[PDB]
Write a protein that binds this ligand. Structure first.
Ligand SMILES: [Mg+2]
Ligand SMILES: [Mg+2]
Ligand SMILES: [Mg+2]
Ligand SMILES: [Mg+2]
Ligand SMILES: [Mg+2]
Ligand SMILES: [Mg+2]
Ligand SMILES: [Mg+2]
Ligand SMILES: [Mg+2]
Ligand SMILES: [Mg+2]
Ligand SMILES: [Mg+2]
Ligand SMILES: [Mg+2]
Ligand SMILES: [Mg+2]
Ligand SMILES: [Mg+2]
Ligand SMILES: [Zn+2]
Lengths: 98, 24, 64, 206, 60, 84
RNA sequence: CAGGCCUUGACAUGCUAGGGAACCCGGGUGAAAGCCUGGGGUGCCCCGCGAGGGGAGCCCUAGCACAGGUGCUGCAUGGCCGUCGUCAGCUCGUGCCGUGAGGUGUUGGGUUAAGUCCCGCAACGAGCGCAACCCCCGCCGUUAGUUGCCAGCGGUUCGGCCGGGCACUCUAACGGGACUGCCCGCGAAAGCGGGAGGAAGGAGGGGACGACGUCUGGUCAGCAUGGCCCUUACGGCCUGGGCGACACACGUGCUACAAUGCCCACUACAAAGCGAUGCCACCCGGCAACGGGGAGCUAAUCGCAAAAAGGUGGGCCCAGUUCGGAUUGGGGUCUGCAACCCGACCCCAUGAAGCCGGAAUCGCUAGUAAUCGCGGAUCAGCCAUGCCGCGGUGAAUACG
């Protein structure tokens, strides 16, 4: 009954990762609770375009943090064996907690 | 109105709470 | 009904009703549509653009 | 005063970042400073080699760092002793225990960052700006490319009235958000002041 | 930015109310962003280079 | 309608410095920079000199002005009108 | 700005040297900085019986290379930006015309939001720009279900609470969908008008994106950089004052002059955000700000939150008023070393001008204006009515 929470700036980097974590544990154990999206928190940065004056320049920036769930219930050694061994994504930070 | 700090709206405006605008 | 204001909800409810009506009897469209009830009003709150005060409301200038 | 950075303009599309690492709302302003500190050295103790891009990945006290260069030999070192000096002198900036790499630039004539450097280089010596530009535009065009463009600013030729020399060939569609145009800028300290040098290289499209 | 004024780096201020910020990069102070440690100018520059991971151009 | 709470602040520069004067007599003038100090009974009778940010001014502290922060009797601006 | 104070200097690299050099804790003076002083206190590699001799890190002083300067020049500059203007343009190659500067192409006729496209033509093409490629919103499908839900059944302390279910809403990733494709008419063509189907129709709505150039445009106080200038001071520390001064003038705004309103009560609909010494449920104390305690959340599963306008009821009765809150007196909370100069908030008292504004002048063509509330960055706190952004209710008018 392990709940995995994957997050990342790139949505495909997660879609990629998360997909693996599923296909993997989709054998050694349960078929997982399916990867779930979860709302995305978004950072905004509104910075005056040029230095000095021109208060009306602006330009908009944003740092979008995506999330996922997966959620694997019924861990069976190998279920955890397909995990700790195979890893890849760089822009993906994982959180496994049952 | 929004100007009066000792009324419902006065508070809401100044975004405060008090006798005139209780935190429920 | 969830989201927005009751005036907006009234309209959505009006769509849902117009829609279900069609499942009950598809032949309703031919007469329910000439009124456009089956159209999804796409009018929406415009983004607040920088520089201006409200998407459009433009700050005013004195003796330009 | 106009024109968006051609790179920043297409990060979502045809153009990856130069630092790709997961979340971090309490350390972002630390890994970043680090990524910076890093590039600091690399864009110094690695100039003469064609430093054309310093990528960086991470994963819990583990930095990747992939220095792309036109002359890796200069990076590696005799038999391979300098790349060893870097790594060490490098982990002196940050513990972390960070890797390193040296992928080469297959043809620096199609590397905007480099082309900028070449032109800025000659200028620093004392070559004919207009020439330098025409030639570079050529080379870049000469070695493939679907378009190229170079822009030197400053006091061209030590002149007192700052100007701006042009030069471009083929297509350089800055608006078409998908063209895939490599951008590069190069400074140019001079006996009489700075000169900016911009290079645009158009490669394929889709 | 006076080199001298970047004394702020002195985590040794008589009282914490005197401790301010300053840009990590340009050494500014007028409008630095906590999440980055960079000023509004430095942030746009780095942002554009793609050196700010995950950061991008907001459109909507 | 001033405020402080619980601790009516006083810079012990002159505080410990004023109570020592009481133990004996009254020292003519006592230059201070603790413009931020709250006046207290003890200070009464004394003569603390406060800084404008330019000069030190003689301020005979009375029992009816206790509580008022020091300075506050040492104006900063020099304004005599725009008239002409 | 005034005063106190330091000088190789708060920060980089390096040399000569009287000479102790690592380090650690106090005292004196002072506003602080600084200055004077007592004093636990040197291992290190190396020669040596040892007195002692010498080097390395560190370390103070003298002297040197030198630091440092938001000190001047945006008419020496890079970089970034503003601007015409998102306007429909600006050019090139070869050819052709002209003695030549140059011209043609890019003009002409139709058309478009557009140098958009069509037709024509000594021009044939090309590039920058227009459009398209990207993002958000409208409809639908697949994938995913701790959001959702008696849609469907059972239990209910009747709160979707519980079992349970992925249907719906939603969440987020991919994908379909519109192309003047289809019918009618005009047309040489592009295209124009009208009609059908469709959530959507002729660029469906909003963004990002800004041509060659223009202005001796803006910024050397973001940064960078040529030159000039100061180097016991045009550098550095500190304490305090000033940037908050006022007889006045202007710009941008806030609140309002009221009954389509003000007020008190009860009651209902939102989105986008934010949260570690952080948001703070709930309880208690206090009129209150807030305080004491204290659960939950690292945050679709907890919190900020109350949305306000609206709805139902009740009061006021046209008054400078139960309109409007300036100003001042008093008491107090919180932040912070500290709120006199110079914070915000609470409560009592006070309760100003103001009755819709002269000449003149501004914004906006629809989910716009108008009106209402909500969030965020910076940030201890805050002078935010500023700014960036979110959703609610939702017009008038355009002959020309
Ligand atoms: Mg009132
Ligand atoms: Mg609105
Ligand atoms: Mg501060
Ligand atoms: Mg200029
Ligand atoms: Mg300039
Ligand atoms: Mg000027
Ligand atoms: Mg002629
Ligand atoms: Mg001829
Ligand atoms: Mg065209
Ligand atoms: Mg375009
Ligand atoms: Mg000028
Ligand atoms: Mg000011
Ligand atoms: Mg318009
Ligand atoms: Zn900066």
């Amino acid at each position: 009954k392990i709940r995995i929470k994957l997050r990342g700036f790139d949505h495909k980097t997660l879609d990629a990762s998360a997909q693996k974590i599923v296909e993997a544990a989709r054998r050694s154990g349960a078929q997982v609770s399916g990867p779930i999206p979860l709302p995305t928190r978004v950072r905004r940065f509104t910075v005056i375009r040029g230095p000095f004056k021109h208060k009306d320049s602006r330009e908009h920036f944003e740092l979008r943090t995506h999330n996922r769930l997966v959620d694997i219930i019924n861990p069976n050694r190998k279920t955890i064996e397909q995990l700790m061994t195979l890893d890849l994504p760089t822009g993906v930070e994982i959180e496994i907690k049952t | 109105g929004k100007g009066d700090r000792r009324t419902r709206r006065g508070k809401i405006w100044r975004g405060t709470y008090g006798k005139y605008r209780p935190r429920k | 009904v969830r989201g927005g204001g009751k005036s907006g909800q009234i309209d959505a409810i009006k769509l849902g009703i117009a829609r279900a009506l069609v499942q009950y009897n598809p032949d309703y469209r031919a007469k329910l549509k000439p009124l456009g009830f089956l159209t999804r009003d796409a009018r929406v709150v415009e983004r607040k653009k920088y520089g201006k005060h409200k998407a459009r409301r433009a700050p005013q200038y004195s003796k330009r | 005063g106009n024109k968006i950075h051609p790179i920043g303009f297409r990060l979502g599309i045809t153009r990856d970042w130069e630092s790709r690492w997961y979340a971090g709302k309490k350390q972002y302003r630390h890994l970043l400073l680090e990524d910076q500190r890093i590039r600091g050295l690399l864009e110094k103790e690695l100039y003469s080699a064609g430093l054309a891009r310093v990528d960086i990945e991470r994963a819990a006290d583990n930095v990747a760092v992939t220095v792309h260069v036109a002359k890796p030999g200069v990076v590696i070192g005799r038999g391979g002793e300098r790349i060893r000096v870097l790594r060490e002198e490098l982990a002196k900036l940050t513990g972390k225990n960070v890797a390193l790499n040296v992928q080469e630039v297959q043809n620096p004539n199609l590397s905007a960052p480099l082309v900028a450097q070449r032109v800025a280089e000659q200028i620093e010596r004392r070559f004919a700006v207009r020439r330098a530009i025409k030639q570079a535009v050529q080379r870049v065009m000469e070695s493939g490319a679907k378009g190229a463009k170079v822009i030197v600013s400053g006091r061209i030729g030590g002149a007192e009235q700052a100007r701006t020399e042009w030069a471009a060939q083929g297509r350089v569609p800055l608006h078409t958000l998908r063209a895939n145009i490599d951008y590069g800028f190069a400074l140019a300290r001079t006996t009489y002041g700075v000169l900016g040098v911009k290079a645009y290289i158009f490669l394929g499209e889709v | 930015a006076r080199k001298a004024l970047i004394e702020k780096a002195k985590r040794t201020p008589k009282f914490k109310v005197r401790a301010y910020t300053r840009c990590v990069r340009c050494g500014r102070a007028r409008s630095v962003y906590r999440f980055f440690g960079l000023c509004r100018i430095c942030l746009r520059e780095l942002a554009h280079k793609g050196q700010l991971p995950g950061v991008r151009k907001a459109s909507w | 309608p001033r405020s402080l709470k619980k601790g009516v602040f006083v810079d012990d520069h002159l505080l410990e410095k004023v109570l020592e004067l009481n133990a004996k007599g009254e020292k003519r003038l006592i230059k201070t920079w603790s413009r931020r100090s709250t006046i207290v009974p003890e200070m009464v009778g004394h003569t603390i000199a406060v800084y404008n940010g330019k000069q030190h001014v003689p301020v005979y502290i009375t029992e009816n002005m206790v509580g008022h922060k020091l300075g506050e009797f040492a104006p900063t601006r020099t304004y005599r009108g725009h008239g002409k």
